[PDB]
Design a protein around this ligand. Structure first.
Ligand SMILES: O[C@@H]1[C@H](O)[C@H](O)CO[C@H]1O
Length: 271
């Protein structure tokens, strides 16, 4: 069997566990051998994973960057070693990449901000819990959100990163609440941070602030069905994983593939 390596940014996130479950499932069918390596949100650990793979007979590198501007060195490592690189979910700012499979995050952010102005109203006071700073996913969701901010004339009380983490989202929202109790709505750039934020509000006795997440994870949906989470922007993690192995297969077969592969978004609300 040929070996395909998946270098995922972290396994401490349901989304990436689904992205990896999809890859595994597709590789299994196509007959490939998939090696999964956790970078644990550490650019240095990521870089160390790519060097380790190059001497292992890794045919294709499927990589989800910890930092879109720092992964440049690890991608050029694979280039020198003549191992094709396909970035999943987050793009690389440098290095030679064969194909990029991701969602339209600039869109998903705007959809988020439009739904907020629909339920909370124009001129709503909002707090944005951003994701890992130099990742393209966070950078894009912020751009799209700013489109809703400008269009719906939102008053952004605060905007701060909680690194796509639940606990960190719980603590970031806790301190922001202390200084901004008049917050009407929260846009959390992923479901983990949204669930964290929902717990902070609970702790503060504010079961009235409108929270919108992103990803549509199993937990992210549960909360929607319990009326706890107003809405989340569902992504298809399992399909960004499958599309990675499939595109990896076609490249190993000499077939020419597209430099970009989009995956649909879908607003999720209770019903
Ligand atoms: O798109 C992914 C998901 O939103 C995940 O929850 C955090 O990292 C982002 O890049």
């Amino acid at each position: 069997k040929d070996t395909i390596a998946l270098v995922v940014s972290t396994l401490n996130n349901p989304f990436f566990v689904s992205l990896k479950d999809g890859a595994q499932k597709e590789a299994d069918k196509l007959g490939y051998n998939l090696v999964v390596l956790d970078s644990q949100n550490n650019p240095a650990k990521e870089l160390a994973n790519v060097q380790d793979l190059t001497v292992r007979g890794t045919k294709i590198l499927l990589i989800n960057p910890t930092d879109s501007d720092a992964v440049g060195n690890a991608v050029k490592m694979a280039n020198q070693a003549n191992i094709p690189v396909i970035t999943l979910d987050r793009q690389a700012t440098k290095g030679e990449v064969v194909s990029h499979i991701a969602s339209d995050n600039v869109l998903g952010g705007k959809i988020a901000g439009d739904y907020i102005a629909k339920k909370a109203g124009e001129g709503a006071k909002v707090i944005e819990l951003q994701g890992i700073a130099r990742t393209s996913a966070a950078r894009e969701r912020g751009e799209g959100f700013q489109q809703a901010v400008a269009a719906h004339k939102f008053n952004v009380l605060a905007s701060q990163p909680a690194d796509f983490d639940r606990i960190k989202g719980l603590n970031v929202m806790q301190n922001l609440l202390t200084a901004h109790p008049d917050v009407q709505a929260v846009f959390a750039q992923n479901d983990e941070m949204a669930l964290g934020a929902l717990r902070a509000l609970q702790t503060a006795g504010k079961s009235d602030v409108m929270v919108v997440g992103f990803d549509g994870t199993p937990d992210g949906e549960k909360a929607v069905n319990d009326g706890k989470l107003a809405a989340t922007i569902a992504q298809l993690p399992d399909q960004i994983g499958a599309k990675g192995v499939e595109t990896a297969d076609k490249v190993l077969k000499g077939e020419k593939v597209q430099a970009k592969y989009p995956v649909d978004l879908k607003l999720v609300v209770k019903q």
